[PDB]
Symmetry: D2
Subunit: 26 residues, 4 copies
Amino acid sequence: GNADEXYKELEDXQERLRKXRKKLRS
Amino acid sequence: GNADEXYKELEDXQERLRKXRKKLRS
Amino acid sequence: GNADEXYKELEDXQERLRKXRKKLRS
Amino acid sequence: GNADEXYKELEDXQERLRKXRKKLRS
């Protein structure tokens, strides 16, 4: 519910998508 | 191509998360 | 940056993932 | 199976978004 908590959770999701783009191709 | 099209959608979601993190900062 | 804006954007992302689960299989 | 494993990860992200929306509400 706090801005910093959301910033970190959103970053984790963003990074997981970044990794899945690579995994999808490998 | 299914893999290619899926990759594009993952990257679009990744981009929206990056933009939302920018919006959280301000 | 507002709670309601974020709630709607997060829902849109959630629903896109819901749709991609189906598209991945079809 | 790659498609199956990818599906699971999409559903996990979908679940986290649902939980974050619940956190935004409160």
